[PDB]
Write a protein that binds this ligand. Structure first.
Ligand SMILES: O=C(O)c1c(CN2C(=O)Cc3cc(Cl)ccc32)ccc2c1OCO2
Ligand SMILES: O=C(O)c1c(CN2C(=O)Cc3cc(Cl)ccc32)ccc2c1OCO2
Lengths: 149, 149
């Protein structure tokens, strides 16, 4: 549980936003790239695994699941790369609802930034700190600290 | 002290590596940029504060301390921006020692990547996972979890 993350790719302003969700907490990290490629996804995963103890990643599609560059980065970082098939059907809708909510947050900040990448990182900040009771940033730290102890 | 970070800028291959250290744990996040401007520093800080509960940052020099763009991002993200003056003189040397160790790690992986940015993220991964006994990634999570609770 503590080490499982889900990759998700969504589109806005002709660009791609790559998102990693920590499944147990809903904490996210995201980046803007011009298009999804194996190389961009592999670099994103290397960044993520240097920051949090990433044991398993459910990939967002079969191209990233197949990608030799993505498999190389998973090997390097000690990540088990898995498929992202919603064997649990509530999962299509949950990723749908996350993208919808992100895009909403991005729309609420979009005027405070010239470049979409800034607005996405403002949205990551707002999402991770939202209490709506703990925030996602609090939950992930509690989860992993409980795991270590 | 769970929320205090130190910014550090170091040079390699004609490029600049921007580093944030979480002072109590030694955990780091880093990025490669072509040069250290207010805009780049401000974006780096927005990224960092969306990911960890960053309360105070000791800026790495007076240009970033003065920068209106950096002060805008610290305002937006709820960060107290401070100077990075080593009132406690063991601080020049500790920052020095960190850069030298990062650069050593980078040299140990530099052949496994074409682009410096990949090697720096490999170095972040190896630094944060190194056991020293807990790693820096473990220390930071235990510190912040103890603080939440
Ligand atoms: O509101 C949401 O649906 C949401 C979520 C929901 N979320 C969780 O809490 C757990 C989880 C697992 C997965 Cl696999 C996907 C989304 C989520 C996460 C991140 C977000 C969200 O909105 C923006 O960022
Ligand atoms: O070994 C080091 O000197 C080192 C450190 C040392 N470090 C700590 O453990 C606490 C700390 C506070 C500060 Cl303000 C700077 C460096 C460190 C941190 C990050 C690193 C390091 O090497 C690479 O990344």
């Amino acid at each position: 549980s503590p080490g499982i993350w889900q990759l998700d790719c969504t589109h806005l302003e002709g660009k791609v936003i790559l998102v990693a969700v920590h499944v147990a907490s809903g904490y996210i990290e995201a980046e803007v790239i011009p298009a999804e490629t194996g190389q961009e996804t592999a670099y994103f995963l290397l960044k993520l695994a240097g920051r949090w103890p990433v044991k398993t990643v459910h990939t967002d599609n079969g191209s990233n699941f197949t990608s030799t560059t993505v498999k190389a980065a998973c090997w390097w970082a000690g990540i088990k790369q898995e498929d992202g098939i919603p064997y649990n059907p509530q999962s299509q809708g949950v990723i749908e609802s996350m993208n919808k909510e992100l895009k909403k947050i991005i729309g609420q900040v979009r005027d405070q930034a010239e470049h979409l990448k800034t607005a996405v990182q403002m949205a990551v900040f707002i999402h991770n700190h939202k209490r709506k009771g703990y925030s996602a940033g609090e939950r992930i730290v509690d989860i992993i600290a409980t795991d270590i102890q």
